[PDB]
Amino acid sequence: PYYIPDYKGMEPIGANIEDLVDYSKDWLSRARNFSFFEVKGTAVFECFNSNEANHCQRYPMSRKPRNFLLIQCSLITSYKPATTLSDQIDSRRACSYILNLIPDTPASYLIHDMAYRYINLTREDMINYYAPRIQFKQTQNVREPGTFKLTSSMLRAESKAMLDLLNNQIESLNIASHIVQSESVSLITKILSDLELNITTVLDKFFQNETQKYLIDVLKKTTAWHIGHLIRDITESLIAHSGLKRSKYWSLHSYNNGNVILFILPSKSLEVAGSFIRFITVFRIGPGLVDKDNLDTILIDGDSQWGVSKVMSIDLNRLLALNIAFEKALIATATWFQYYTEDQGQFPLQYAIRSVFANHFLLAICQKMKLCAIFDNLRYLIPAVTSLYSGFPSLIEKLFERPFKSSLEVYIYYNIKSLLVALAQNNKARFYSKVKLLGLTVDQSTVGVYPSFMSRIVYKHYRSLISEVTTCFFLFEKGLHGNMNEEAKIHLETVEWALKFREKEEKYGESLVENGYMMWELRANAELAEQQLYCQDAIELAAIELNK
């Protein structure tokens, strides 16, 4: 029982297809430029070099690379699940090691102060520090079940200085210098080599025959497995400390026979947004996720070396991403393994599996927006260099839009450059043929192997390379795309396009942009053909063709 109001309608203008044919005749009667570019191998290399020069010119130079590993740990032996008894038997021994080291930097002084505070804890408070929350008792030094207090009296001058400092333009690395690139690639290769080092129904039948045998069995002895388990325990402890009650108190934990020590500073709780938890780690030097340059300092013990990292504030989302780093790496490696089996038709070697597992694990540990954007672009550049004509150079500037901060970004850029140059070089020879497609045999300009990214294997179809880059891209948590930079970029894009619309509207009149432009003024101007502007005759003719 509702009647549609009359509102308003539109009078159909007659228009003519012959007028647009005349415009086509006039437009084709000149020189026309092709919006796409040919891929030649030298073209992509020259684009990369020119963009390197432009990026070096646009951003200030930086000689000290920043940090990429959010957590700094090391392992030489095997790892076991952490329990309360293991926690105590490791904390005591870790404090015993720490109290024999001469401090040299204020962070080391704070570490020594915390170790002295913990090793001098009373038996009652020490016992209560490891008690379930239903059973714990309020004390004078320990208040929350897994925390303790540390007042200014126990803090030294250096520790007070760091607490006061913590309580209280954009540069980029020189990409056009081979020394920096070589140093970065050497560091990352060393990290991967350490990670890959070994440490001393019928569906179930199929699983144990193939997957459990060739993926889990191979990766069980890898260093990355135990490193991931250790990071998982660390993340569990950090999440436990993240409570509103437990956030503003100090804490201490140790793992792996006292080798790795976890320190927690009083940080704002994670219930409210924009909150970071501050922690420090001390470990023994050895193979694993170790970066000497990014370490705060190194301490010399008797025939041993002990390293401490700087204050390391992390967010809730990145903490949760780290907690599942090992599982995400395993799922990504399983996806890569399935794709490799589908492509090559056989099973991967145990070296390629280790390499791809290490790469995925390192990607999962280091969650940054730059890497996510780089992989998102790489998802599309590979089709660009696989085809004949494509808009690859603009994709190269898309790669180079953001600054470089860490050595992982340099390493990934180097690998991507090598891969893209190789793919473009492959395209040189294009032979025609005659094979069946659908139900008719037709020609094909088929180019013949596709190099991989995380291993030395070669693929039969580049869809496998696309799947590899896709798997690497999805290893980055959904939510890093809501950073300040992206929001600013989208706001600025919308505003800039609105300003362009306003400029066109004021230059050509309100109604001209509103209702579209007639065709005679288009042919008398020849500039009206652009975005954000449409021809009424064109809309008429398109409607007529669709109506046909």
Which residues, 5 to 64, sit near other proteins by CB under 8 A? 6-10, 12, 17, 20-21, 24-32, 34-36
Nearer to other proteins (CB atom), residue 108 or residue 333: 333
Contact yes or no for 294/72 (Cβ under 8 A)? yes
Nearer to other proteins (CB atom), residue 77 or residue 515: 515
**Residue type at 470?**
T
Give the span between the Cα atoms of 472 and 227, in whole angstroms.
Answer: 20
Separation in Å, CA 525 to CA 397, 489, 521, 530:
33, 34, 6, 12
Total number of residues binding other proteins (CB under 8 A)?
A: 97
Smallest Cα–Cα separation from 475: which of 412, 417, 521? 412
- Taking phi over 0 as left and psi of -120 to 50 as alpha, with beta for the rest, 479 belongs to left
Residues numbered 273 to 302 that lie near other proteins (CB under 8 A) are none
Residues numbered 387 to 426 that lie near other proteins (CB under 8 A) are 387-391, 394-395, 398
> Minimum distance from CB of 87 to other proteins (Å)?
36
> Minimum distance from CB of 274 to other proteins (Å)?
9
> Minimum distance from CB of 23 to other proteins (Å)?
9
Residues numbered 468 to 487 that lie near other proteins (CB under 8 A) are 470-471, 474, 484, 487
Nearer to other proteins (CB atom), residue 208 or residue 494: 494
Nearer to other proteins (CB atom), residue 18 or residue 164: 18
Give the span between the Cα atoms of 118 and 151, in whole angstroms.
Answer: 13
Nearer to other proteins (CB atom), residue 258 or residue 516: 516
**Residue type at 288?**
G
Nearer to other proteins (CB atom), residue 130 or residue 276: 276
> Minimum distance from CB of 533 to other proteins (Å)?
6
**Residues near 54 by beta carbon (within 8 Å), at least 6 away in sequence:** 400
Q: Which of 4, 157, 179, 524 binds other proteins (CB under 8 A)?
A: 4
Residues numbered 504 to 533 that lie near other proteins (CB under 8 A) are 505, 513-516, 522, 529-533
3-class DSSP assignment, residue 306: strand
The answer to whether 437 contacts other proteins (rule: CB under 8 A) is yes
Give the span between the Cα atoms of 416 and 494, in whole angstroms.
Answer: 31
> Minimum distance from CB of 394 to other proteins (Å)?
5
> Minimum distance from CB of 133 to other proteins (Å)?
36
**Residue type at 102?**
I
**Residue type at 527?**
E
Give the span between the Cα atoms of 215 and 197, in whole angstroms.
Answer: 15
> Minimum distance from CB of 43 to other proteins (Å)?
14
> Minimum distance from CB of 446 to other proteins (Å)?
6
3-class DSSP assignment, residue 70: coil
Give the span between the Cα atoms of 411 and 404, in whole angstroms.
Answer: 11
Per-residue x/- mask for other proteins, residues 155 to 184, rule CB under 8 A? --------------x---------------
CA-CA-CA-CA torsion sign (226, 228, 231, 233): negative
- Dihedral over alpha carbons 531, 537, 540, 546 (to 10 degrees): -70
The answer to whether 331 contacts other proteins (rule: CB under 8 A) is yes
